[PDB]
Amino acid sequence: EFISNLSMQTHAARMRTFMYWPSSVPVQPEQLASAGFYYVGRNDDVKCFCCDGGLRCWESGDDPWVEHAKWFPRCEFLIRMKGQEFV
Ligand SMILES: CN[C@@H](C)C(=O)N[C@H](C(=O)N1CCC[C@H]1c1nc(C(=O)c2ccc(F)cc2)cs1)C1CCCCC1
Numbered sequence: 001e002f003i004s005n006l007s008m009q010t011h012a013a014r015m016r017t018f019m020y021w022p023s024s025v026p027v028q029p030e031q032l033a034s035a036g037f038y039y040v041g042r043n044d045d046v047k048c049f050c051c052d053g054g055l056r057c058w059e060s061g062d063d064p065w066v067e068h069a070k071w072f073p074r075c076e077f078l079i080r081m082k083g084q085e086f087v
């Protein structure tokens with residue numbers, strides 16, 4: 001129910017934070033932002049606007065939605081978008 005970062009509630013706002021995303025990181029800002037993540041501005045650290053979970057060390061082939069569900073399966077934004085079955 002409760003949203004940790006209301007300023008990062010829209011995907012456009014989240015996508016804006018990836019302005020200085022390192023291009024050597026092999027995961028795309030558009031998929032990070034769509035999966036609820038915004039960039040904290042250092043290294044490849046991101047957080048989810050809803051559950052406040054953090055993820056780093058993004059690997060080639062990582063799916064932000066799958067990684068979101070692996071580590072933060074009770075995130076209400078995750079469940080709302082992808083369904084309880086996905087988690
Ligand atoms: C391989 N695929 C990627 C997506 C993945 O699974 N990574 C994992 C991950 O990130 N995990 C696991 C759950 C918590 C979160 C972390 N959180 C932290 C922060 O300290 C932190 C603090 C603030 C932030 F904004 C971001 C992060 C450090 S480990 C780890 C996989 C092993 C190697 C280390 C990273």
Ligand SMILES: [Zn+2]
Pocket residue numbers: 036048049050051052053068072075076077078
């Ligand atoms: Zn979340």
